Amino acid sequence: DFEEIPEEY
Amino acid sequence: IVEGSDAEIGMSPWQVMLFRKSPQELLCGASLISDRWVLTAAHCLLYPPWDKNFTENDLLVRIGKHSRTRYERNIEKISMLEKIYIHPRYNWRENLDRDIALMKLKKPVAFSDYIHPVCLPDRETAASLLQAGYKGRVTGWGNLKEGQPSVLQVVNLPIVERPVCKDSTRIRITDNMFCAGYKPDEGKRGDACEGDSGGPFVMKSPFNNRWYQMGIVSWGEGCDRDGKYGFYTHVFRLKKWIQKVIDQF
Amino acid sequence: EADCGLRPLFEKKSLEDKTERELLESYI
Ligand code: NA
Ligand code: NA
């Protein structure tokens, strides 16, 4: 359900 | 939030989302109280009956958000935790007394239109505002009923008289809690629900027109049930502990 | 915080949100 968060975090 | 409405943009710029890294999911609400300190409920982090015990590296805080699920590029900011501080007398065994935790961020967050700290009450604001019938505001991305919202939800709820709070439950209520919500015959509805835990109950002081966080979403039996009320950590009553942590750390 | 509790998109602009007055009216 949650969109992808930037790998850097 | 049950029987709430969609927030306006920037209506709650202190709202924080506690986010599970793996699997990615909402864990809880939380609030920004400075550029490096985040306030939440202890039970969001530590609740042995449910095998819950998170460490810093388990989590992210997401600040500036509106949409629940989307990654809000150029708006939200995502912060890693440096250290979690749980109240030493948090009572997870019985009634969640002193349900409060601080999180120290690794790096300060930059304030923006969408990111701004809430105030914590002084004794005089708490005395003036924590009265039966006076309304506060609760915000969160939790359940809409006992699906999940597309965006942050808001609901305004009146503080309830201590004997009504006590008579609504078999749980032992303490001075470190207060309860809020409408009575069965008041007409209106509304409550916090799963996922909203750890988020803020705020009030707008009529003396200086600033928002103060008076409560932390702590516990409730079910969500929005008639004759039941949501319980909130009384932030002023635990302010010495908050100050001591921020002072010592 | 010196500027705490004052929202950029509301108090800092003298704009009210759609339900804050429900709260003020309860502070009787
Ligand atoms: Na009782
Ligand atoms: Na209720």
Q: Where are the domains of chain C?
A: 1-28
Looking at the DSSP bridge assignments, the partners of residue B202 are B137, B213
Residues B155 and B112 placed together within one structural domain of the fold:
no
The experimental method, as deposited, was X-ray
CATH hierarchy code of domain C1-28: 4.10.140.10
Q: Within 10 A of B118 (CB to CB), how many other CB atoms are there?
A: 24
Q: Please state the domain count of chain B.
A: 2
Residues B88 and B1 placed together within one structural domain of the fold:
no
Residues B85 and B68 placed together within one structural domain of the fold:
yes
Say whether B59 sits in a helix, a strand or coil. Answer: strand
Residues B222 and B191 placed together within one structural domain of the fold:
yes
Residues B84 and B125 placed together within one structural domain of the fold:
no
Name the minimum distance, in Å, from the CA of B87 to any CA of chain C: 22
Residues B187 and B129 placed together within one structural domain of the fold:
yes
Please give the angle made by the CA atoms of B117, B119 and B125, to the nearest 5 degrees: 170
Q: How far is CA B69 from the centre of its chain?
A: 19
What CATH number did the domain enclosing B189 receive? 2.40.10.10
Best of A4, A7, A8, A9 to disrupt the B interface (most B CBs within 10 Å) is A9
B137-148 burial by CB neighbour count: b if 16+ within 10 A, else e?
bbbbbbbbeeeb
Residue numbers of B annotated as active site: 43, 99, 197
Contact call for B136 and C22, based on CB within 8 A: no
Residues B241 and B144 placed together within one structural domain of the fold:
no
Q: Is B200 within 8 Å of B216 (Cβ atoms)? A: yes
Residues B113 and B143 placed together within one structural domain of the fold:
no
Size of interface A-B (CB pairs under 8 A): 21
Residues B144 and B224 placed together within one structural domain of the fold:
yes
The DSSP annotation for B155-207 comes to: EEEEB--HHHHHHT-SSPP-TTEEEE---GGGS---B--TT-TT-EEEEE-TT
Q: For residue B132, which of B92, B166, B81, B83 has the smallest C-alpha distance?
A: B166
Residues B160 and B197 placed together within one structural domain of the fold:
yes
Spell out which residues of chain A touch residue B60, defining contact as CB-CB under 8 Å.
5, 9
Q: Which domain holds residue B168?
A: 1-12+118-236
- Of the ligands numbered here, which is closest to the C-alpha atom of B182? 2
Q: How far is CA C2 from the centre of its chain?
A: 16
Residues B211 and B244 placed together within one structural domain of the fold:
no
DSSP B129: H
Residues B203 and B245 placed together within one structural domain of the fold:
no
Phi, psi of B225 (to 5 degrees): -85, 145
Biggest alpha carbon–alpha carbon distance for chain C: 28
